Amino acid sequence: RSFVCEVCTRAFARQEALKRHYRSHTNEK
């Protein structure tokens, strides 16, 4: 397992870093 962005694939060591990332795939300059 791992914290990878299914959208793009960007992996993050910190989950929060991911969730926050996924926000960019929606609305988060």
Q: Which residues of the shown chain bind Zn ion in the complex (CB under 5 A)? A: 5, 7-8, 10
Closest approach, Cβ 5 to Zn ion, in A, equals 3
Report whether 3 contacts 12 (CB < 8 A).
Answer: yes
**Backbone break loci in the chain, preceding residues, C–N > 2.5 A:** none
Q: Which is nearer to Zn ion, 3 or 10 (CB)?
A: 10
Q: Are 25 and 8 in contact (CB under 8 A)?
A: yes
Distance in Å, CB of 23 to Zn ion, minimum: 10
Output the smallest distance, CB 14 to Zn ion, in A. 15
